[PDB]
Design a protein around this ligand. Structure first.
Ligand SMILES: [Cl-]
Ligand SMILES: [Cl-]
Ligand SMILES: [Cl-]
Ligand SMILES: [Cl-]
Ligand SMILES: [Cl-]
Ligand SMILES: [Cl-]
Lengths: 666, 672, 672
C-alpha cells in the first residue's frame, strides 16, 4: 500500500460569526477565543432542531496548525474534504488552495506546494451556510443545510506521478460495464494519471479484477512514458466469462478492481474500487428488472441527520440507519435530497440495496442556480460513479415557476447526467398529480410526490389517481417518490376521517397507520407504479417551521428522530415486505381507550393469528387490505384494564405479542 | 495468424561423397545423377547400423530449386533447419547464407535478401559429418553422428518488423520464473524485436498468458517506435496468484504464452510458447523436490536412432519412444548425449516427464573444441529455454586427459550455462566411481556412470560404493547417470555368476535382468542418489565396434533397437515403478532349459501371486529384493513341455501370466 | 593483500619455426639452440615494419623452467597471459594447461594441480600467428598480428577458495550501475567464487566501496557455506547517495571497489576495481551526453605498435601515446581494431578519456569465423567490463560479401554484447558512404569510414554527404569513424588539387593538412555526426603493402611511427580542440619553396596574430575555415631565404612562432 491516506479530523479550533464590519472590531473577534472542536462538526446541531425560525446561518472559520516533516520532499500532498456546509475556502499558510460551493459533495486540493516542510503549517477553512440564489438548495425550507465541516477530512500523500486525486475529488477511476448477463459482461476501467514532474516518466499501469474471495480474475498491464503535460487517460477492458452477478439483496456479490501505478517494478500509487456486475432495466407499466428478473422495489427515504448530532454523523449512525432500512425489508432507498455519505453508499453495494441519489434542486428556482446545479450534479456522478447500488440520478424535486426556466434547467441536468454517465437513468420529481405539468418529462423517469388524504383529497384517492395515469400514459415510467403522513406518538385516537387537517396541531399516530395500511395495498396492486418511496424512514429536522405541536420537526418517520422508537407503520411495512417473521398488534401506544366497542388489528406474515382479549380468545377475525392484515371488528372491552395477546405458529415455533389497553367512561 | 511457417522438406536431391581431388573427376561426380530424396534424410541409416567400423563420413550435397512469388516483396524470408549432421553450409543462388557446426542444434538464416522474386531460386546445402578436433563430439566412438539433413526444414515468412527468427534459431521469446510456490509466481517474458527497415516503426508489443483451457489471464501491452538500429529487447512481468503448478506426471498443467507484435492495431507477428509453472530443488542426501514435494526420479535414457531409420525420425517415432517411457513408469529422462528434437522436449512438457538435456562433449578432449562446445551449449539452452520439463543442462560425459584442460572447459561451460539461464542446474558425468577425480565438481551436480559387475567388479559392489560415497561426501548433489548391462535376446542361460566378461560374445538376457533386479533395490534405498538413469531404454547403433555377436549395436536397452521387443528388465522396472497392474514371469525367452531343478521368478506389483507348474500350484514362494519380487526355487521340471501359469486377483479383477519351457537332459550354454 | 600477483617475464627461452616435419629432423631442431629473450616479445618487430609482403607467420615456442616450493601445497596457482599473437597452447611439464585463439585478449589457466612442488617445473608455450579462416582477423591486410608473447605474463597464487581468476580471465567481479544522477546511483557488484576442495567451506564475502580519497562509503557483507560443486555467483547492491560523478576530462572521479573473501575472520582473497559513476547517452541528430550534459566528442584512433618494437610495448609507451592524445585535445579514442591493453584502458579511466573498444573482425569474412568472433567479443567485454571510459563495443569494420552471412554475424555479435553487457552501446563500421548498405544497421550505432579527396571524390564532398544523411535518416545514430590523408614528411608541395592520386608514390604532408583543415570545419557544424574519429593519431605498420614510397607503412598518422615528429594537422587539431595556448605556422618542413608568391597559414586559438616576412609585418590577413584558421595570400617571397615570425598576445604573455623558407627559382615537385 503506497498511497497514504490519514484522518485529518483532529485538533481543529472554531470561531463562529456573525462578524463585525469594522476592521478594528473584526480583528478583535478574530483575536478572541476559538472553541476547540472535533470533526465531524457543525454549528446547527441544536439551533436547527430545538426551535424553528431561529438558527445561525452565515460564516465560521476553522483553524489548525500542523507539523509537516522533510520526508515529504518530492511527494504531493492533498486535503480531501468529504463534506462542508455550504461554501468553503481553504487557505494554507494564507495561500488560497481551493473553494467549493455545495454542502454535500467532497472536494480535494493539492496543498503540497504551499507547505513549508520541516515546519508548522496553518490550515484554515472559511465555511458559510447562508442561502444564496446561485447555489442549491436556494433556501432552507424543506430542510436545513447544517453548517460547518460535518464530514471527515483526510490527508492524502502520493508520489510525483499518481492516479489523479483531484478529479472532482473522485477516486480517479471509472468502471463501466456493457452487455451484462449470466454468460459474460465487458468491463471497462478508465484511469486518470497525472505526472506533476517536468519530464516524461516511464511507468506501468496494472489493473486487476479480484473475486470477492480474492482470486485474480484478470489482469491488464500497460507500459508507457507518462507525459508531464496534462492529465492522461488510460483504458482497460475485461471480458468476464460467467460473472457472479450482483443480485440485489439475495446475492450482493462484489468483485474488487485494483488499479496500480508502477515504476521500476514498484507500486507508487494505487486505488481500489468495488465492482458489482449487474444490469438494471425499467419497462414502463411492468416494472424493474435486475439482470433480467422482475425485482421488488420496496422504497424508503432517509435524511443525513440524527436528533442531537445534527448532520455530524459517524459510521455507526449510517450503519444503524441501514440496519433499520434492511430489517423493515426495503429493497431500494431514495437518499433525498442531496448527495449523501460515500461510506453510506458503499454499504448499500455490500448490503445489496438498490439506491437513488439526488442533488438538492428543491422547492424554488431563482434563475441563477444552473452552473452550480450542473456542478453539483457532476461531483455527485463522478464521486459516486462506481457504486453498483446506484440506478438513477435525481434532478429536481418540487420546483416550479418560472416554468420555462425550470424545464430548461432540468433538461440540461439530464443532459449532463447522460454525458457524464449514459448508463444510468435520470429522474425528477413533481409535487402535482398530473402528468403533463409544464416541468415534467425531462428525464428518463417521471416521479410524483403524492400525499392523498393529508395535503389533498382523501387517503383512498390514490387509487383513482394512479388508475387514471396509466390509462392516459401507458408508456411513461412512473414512480411514486414520496408518500406517507405525520405521526406524533403523543397523539392518539380512534376517531379518524379519511383526511386530516394538517393545519391543526394534532398528528395522531393512528392516522399514519391508516394511511399506509390502505395506501401500500393500492401501490402493490398497480405494477404501473414501478417503484414507490415512502416518506420518510426517520423523522428529521425542518428549522423553518413548527407543526404538529413540536417545533422544527418533520414527523413522517417510520421511526423517531432519535432512532429509539418504531411507529406502527414500521411493522406494517416489515410485515408486508420482509421474509422475517413479524407478529404485531396495532396501537400499543393508544393505551387509554376512548370507546367500548373497538377494533383490534394484528399484523402477521406467518399465518392467521389468535388474539386473547383478557385471558380469552376473541373471534370473527377477518382479512384487511393484504394477506398480512388481520382485523377483529367488534371487540367489547372490560372496564379498568384490558390485555391483548397474540399467537401464531410456523416451523414448530411460536410467536408472541401483548399490548395493554385501558378503559373507563368514554 | 501473421507468421507463415511451412514445411520445406520436399523436392530436394542428394549427392553423396566421397569426391575426387581432381577437378575433372569432381566435375563429373558433380554433373552425375543426383538422388531425389525426402527430409528427414540421412546417408548413414544403413552403414552405421548393419556393420562395424565401415561407414561413410564426409561431404554430401543437397539441392532444391524453388519458385518464390512476387508476393514476398517487402517481406522477410528465413530457413530454419532443426538439425544437420554435422556441419552445414547453405547457399542461395550461390551466395553463402550461413554456416553451422554441430549436428544437433537448430539453425536459421535469413535468405529473403538473396532471392530473385517472381523467379526460380536454388538452395544448396553442404553437409559434412566427418569428425574433426574442433567440433564435439570429437569422434564417433560412443555413437555415430549420422550425416544429412536428418531433421525437418522450415520456410518462415515475416514482415519487415518481427520477433527475431534468427537468435540462435530460438523462438525469440524467453520465459522466466522466480519465487514459485502454491501462492504465487513471478513470470518474466523477454522478447527480441528486429526492424529490418530504414526508419523507426510504430508498433505495439502485446504479451498474453492464457490458461490451459484458453481463457485469458493477463496481458501486458507496450507501444513504442521500434528502432531500425540493432535488435531490441522488451520485458513483460506477470504476477500469478495461486498458480496452477506443473506437477510432473500427476498434473502437467501448461499455460499458453502468446506474444503478438502489432502495427495499426493489426497483428503482424506472433510467437506462442508453453509455460509450466514450477520450482525444482535438489537437496543432497534427501532427494529431488518439485514445488516443495519430494518426487521420485526414476530415470531412463534414449538415443535418437531407430533400427533402419538411423536418426531420420518422424514425430510418430518420437511419440512411440515417449509412450514406452511413460508406460515403464519413468519420471525423468536423460536425453544423452546431445541436443535432441524440440518436438520431443516439447512433448515431455505435456506428458509431465522431467528431463535432462546434454551437449555431445564426450569420450575424448583434443583441446581445440572449446569455442564449439560453448557454442552448442548456448544454442541448446536458447532453443530450449522455455520447456518447463528441462531441469538441468549436461556439460560433459567421460572426458579425461588432459585433466587441467578438461576441467577448464567444463568450468567455462558450467559458467556459460549460469550466464545464459541461471535458473537451472548443470551436471557433468564421470566414468570412474570416485568423487575426487581431478575433473569432477565443476558443475552443480556430479553424476557418475557405474556398471558394477559388467566392466568392473561384482553386481553387488554397488552397495559398498554408494555407502562409502554418502559417508565421505554427505553434501554433494549426486546422481547415478548410467548403469545396466547388455542383453542379447538370442543369448540365454541360468549359469550366471556375479560378473560377466564383456570381451566374450555372450551377452545373455538373463544376466541383464539379474543386474537390474539387484541394483534397483540398492538405488531405491539410498536417497543420497538424487536420481538414477539406467542405460538404456533402447539398443542403439555403435558403428565403431562389434561386441556381443551383433555388429554396431549397444544392447543395454530394455527394448530392442527396432522397438519391437521388450526385455524382462522392461517389466522389472515397470512393476517397480508403475502403478498399472503388472504380473510377469521372467525367462519366457529362455525356453530351452538346462537344469531339471531351477528357480522361478515372477514380478508382481499387485500382491504375492500363485504359480502353477503343469497345472499344480507351486510353493516355496519367497521374497526377492523388493516387494514386487517373488522367486520359487527350486522347481523340478517334467520332460517335454512345462507350463508356468501365474495368477493373482485384485479387487474383482484377476491377472494371469503363462509361459512355456521345455526340458530334456542337462545342458549349459555358458561353457562356450 | 591475500593474493600474490607477481611478474613472470623472466628466464624465458624462444625458438621460432618453421619446424621440420618428420620426427628425427624435428627432434634435432628441438635440441637446437634456443634464444633467451625478454617478455614482452614478438618475432615480427622487424619483418612487419622494415619491408612489405615478407614476414614470418607461423609457429614459435617459448620455454621457461621454474622452481615451485612446498609452501605452495594446498594453494592454487594460475598463469595469466595478457596477450599472445595469435593462437596459444600452454603445457606444464608437457601437459596441456590451456588453449587460446585470438591474439588480443588475455587468457588464463590453473596450472597448480599439474605442478610438481619442491621441484623444478617446466612451462612451454606454443604460439602461432598464421592467418586462418576461422580466427579473426582472417588476414593481415589492414595490419599484421605481430606474433609471440607480446604482453606481460603473471603468476597468481590463491587459496582453495577464491574470487575466480579463470572466468574468461576477467577480474572475476563485475560492476554495473543503474539510474545515475547527481541525486544518486545504484551500483550492483557481481562476484564469482570458486571452492576447489571437496567440502562446503565457510566464508564471508565483504564488498566495499571507497571514495577516491579512501573513505568507506558503502559496505555489503554476507556469510554462507561455499559449495564445492561448480563456481558460484554473489550480488551486492549499493545505493550511492549524491555520488561524485566521473565527468570525462573535466573531472575523472573514481571510487574504487574492493571485494574481499574471508575465512575464519581472516582474508583469503581480494580483487579491487575502479568505479566511474556516469551515464552515457546518444541522441541521434543532437549529440553525445554525459551525465545529462552534451559533451564534445573529439576523436582519434591508435594502433598498439611502435616503430622498432612492434607490439611488444611497455607501460611508458602507452603512457606516452595517451599524453599526446590528451595533449592534442582529444576527448574520445577509438582503439581499433582489436582488444588493447588493460593498462591502456585503465589509464583512460583516469585521464577521463571516453573510449571505444573493438574486435578485429575486419576486411573480409570467410564464413568460418563466427564462433571465434563471438568468442573474442565475450572475452573483450568480460575483461574490460568495469572500465568507466568504454562507452561502446565495436563489432566489425569494412566486411562485405557474402552480405547475408556478414549480416547474420553482425547480428549475433550485437546480441552477444547485449547479453553480456546490456548497458553499453554497440557499433559497426562500414567503408561505404551510403546508409542502406546490406550489412548496415545491425548495431546501436552506424559508423562510416570516409576519406573524401583521398579514396574517392574531392576533399569538399564531405559536405553534401553529411547534409544528405542528416536529411534522409534523421533518426539514426551516426559516427564518422575514420577520415584523413596519408602524409609523408619527405614529400612537400603547394601544387595541390582538390583530390590526390593515392595511386602514385607521392604523399605530401601539405595534402593531409588541407584535408583536415576543411573537413574538420564541416564536422564541427553538423551535430548529426555524434562523433568523429580521424585516422590516425600515429602512423603504424601495414606489412603487406608498400604505399607512398616506404615499405609497410600507413602514414595517416598525426605523429610518426617512431613518435618523434608531429605533422602539421597535429597542431591544427590542438588549436581547434585544446584549452592551451597554440600559435603555429604551417609548412615548417616544406622549406624548398616552389613559388615566389605563396600563402602563409597560421593557427592561433588566442586572437588574430601578426606575421612577419623577413622583418616587415604582413597585411591582408583574412579568415579561414574555423575561428582558429588564418591565411595570408599572396605573400611575396624574397630571393634566397625568407623567415616568418608569427606573434600574438593575451593575458600579458607573448606568443611567437618562427619558421624559415627560401625561394630560389620556380619549382614544382608535384609534377616531377
Ligand atoms: Cl460593526
Ligand atoms: Cl447492458
Ligand atoms: Cl519498463
Ligand atoms: Cl582422385
Ligand atoms: Cl523459485
Ligand atoms: Cl495480490
Amino acid at each position: 500500500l503506497a498511497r497514504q491516506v490519514t484522518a485529518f479530523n483532529t485538533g481543529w479550533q472554531f470561531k463562529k460569526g456573525p462578524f463585525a464590519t469594522d476592521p478594528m472590531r473584526a480583528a478583535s473577534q478574530w483575536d478572541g477565543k476559538w472553541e476547540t472542536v472535533e470533526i465531524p462538526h457543525t454549528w446547527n446541531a441544536m439551533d436547527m432542531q430545538v426551535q424553528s425560525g431561529s438558527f445561525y446561518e452565515g460564516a465560521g472559520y476553522y483553524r489548525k496548525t500542523q507539523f509537516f516533516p522533510h520526508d515529504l520532499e518530492g511527494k504531493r500532498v492533498f486535503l480531501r474534504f468529504e463534506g462542508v456546509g455550504a461554501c468553503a475556502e481553504v487557505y494554507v499558510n494564507g495561500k488560497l488552495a481551493g473553494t467549493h460551493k455545495g454542502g454535500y459533495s467532497a472536494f480535494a486540493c493539492e496543498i503540497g506546494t504551499a507547505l513549508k516542510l520541516g515546519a508548522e503549517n496553518e490550515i484554515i477553512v472559511k465555511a458559510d451556510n447562508k442561502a444564496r440564489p446561485d447555489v442549491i438548495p436556494v433556501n432552507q425550507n424543506l430542510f436545513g443545510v447544517y453548517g460547518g465541516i460535518y464530514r471527515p477530512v483526510w490527508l492524502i500523500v502520493t508520489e510525483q506521478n499518481n492516479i489523479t486525486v483531484t478529479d472532482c475529488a473522485s477516486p480517479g477511476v471509472y468502471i463501466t460495464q456493457k452487455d451484462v448477463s449470466k454468460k459474460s459482461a465487458d468491463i471497462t476501467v478508465k484511469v486518470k494519471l497525472d505526472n506533476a514532474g517536468l519530464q516524461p516518466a516511464a511507468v506501468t499501469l496494472e489493473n486487476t479484477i479480484y473475486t470477492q474471495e480474492g482470486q485474480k480474475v484478470g489482469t491488464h498491464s500497460r507500459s508507457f512514458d507518462l507525459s508531464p503535460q496534462g492529465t492522461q487517460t488510460y483504458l482497460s477492458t475485461f471480458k468476464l466469462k460467467n460473472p457472479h452477478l450482483w443480485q440485489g439483496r439475495k446475492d450482493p456479490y462484489l468483485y474488487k478492481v485494483v488499479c496500480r501505478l508502477m515504476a521500476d517494478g514498484k507500486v507508487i500509487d494505487e486505488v481500489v474500487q468495488p465492482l458489482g456486475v449487474r444490469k438494471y432495466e425499467i419497462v414502463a407499466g411492468k416494472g424493474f428488472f435486475l439482470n433480467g428478473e422482475k425485482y421488488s422495489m420496496y422504497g424508503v427515504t432517509r435524511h443525513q441527520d440524527w436528533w442531537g448530532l445534527g448532520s455530524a454523523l459517524k459510521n455507526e449512525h449510517h450503519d444503524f440507519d441501514l440496519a433499520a432500512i434492511m430489517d423493515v425489508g426495503a429493497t431500494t432507498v431514495r437518499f433525498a435530497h442531496y448527495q449523501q455519505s460515500d461510506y453510506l453508499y458503499s454499504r448499500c453495494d455490500t448490503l445489496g440495496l438498490i439506491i437513488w441519489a439526488e442533488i438538492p434542486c428543491v422547492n424554488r428556482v431563482t434563475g441563477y442556480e444552473t452552473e452550480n446545479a450542473q456542478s453539483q450534479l457532476r461531483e455527485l456522478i463522478r464521486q459516486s460513479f462506481n457504486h453498483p447500488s446506484i440506478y438513477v440520478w435525481g434532478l429536481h424535486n418540487e420546483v416550479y415557476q418560472p416554468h420555462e426556466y425550470t424545464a430548461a434547467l432540468t433538461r440540461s441536468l439530464h443532459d449532463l447526467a447522460k454525458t457524464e454517465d449514459p448508463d444510468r437513468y435520470t429522474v425528477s420529481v413533481n409535487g402535482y398529480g398530473h402528468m403533463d405539468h409544464p416541468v415534467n418529462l425531462n428525464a428518463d423517469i417521471q416521479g410524483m410526490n403524492r400525499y392523498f388524504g393529508w395535503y389533498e383529497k382523501k387517503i383512498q384517492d390514490i387509487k383513482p389517481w394512479v388508475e387514471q395515469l396509466e390509462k392516459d400514459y401507458p408508456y411513461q415510467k412512473l414512480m411514486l417518490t414520496e408518500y406517507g403522513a405525520d405521526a406524533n406518538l403523543a397523539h392518539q385516537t380512534e376517531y379518524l376521517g379519511d383526511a386530516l387537517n394538517w393545519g391543526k396541531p394534532f398528528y395522531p399516530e393512528t392516522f399514519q397507520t391508516k394511511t399506509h395500511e390502505y395506501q401500500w395495498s393500492i401501490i402493490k396492486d398497480h405494477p404501473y407504479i414501478i417503484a414507490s418511496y415512502l416518506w420518510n424512514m426517520f423523522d428529521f429536522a425542518v428549522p423553518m417551521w413548527t407543526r404538529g405541536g413540536v417545533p422544527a420537526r418533520n414527523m413522517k418517520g417510520l421511526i423517531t428522530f432519535d432512532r429509539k422508537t418504531k411507529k406502527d407503520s414500521y411493522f406494517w411495512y416489515k410485515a408486508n415486505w420482509s421474509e422475517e417473521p413479524v407478529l404485531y398488534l396495532t396501537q400499543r401506544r393508544n393505551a387509554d381507550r376512548e370507546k367500548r366497542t373497538t377494533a383490534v388489528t394484528v399484523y402477521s406474515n406467518i399465518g392467521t393469528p389468535k388474539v386473547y382479549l383478557n385471558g380469552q380468545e376473541l373471534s370473527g377475525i377477518r382479512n384487511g387490505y393484504t394477506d398480512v392484515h388481520y382485523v377483529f371488528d367488534n371487540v367489547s372491552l372490560a372496564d379498568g384494564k384490558n390485555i391483548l395477546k397474540a399467537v401464531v405458529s410456523t416451523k414448530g415455533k411460536e410467536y408472541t405479542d401483548e399490548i395493554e389497553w385501558n378503559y373507563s367512561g368514554e
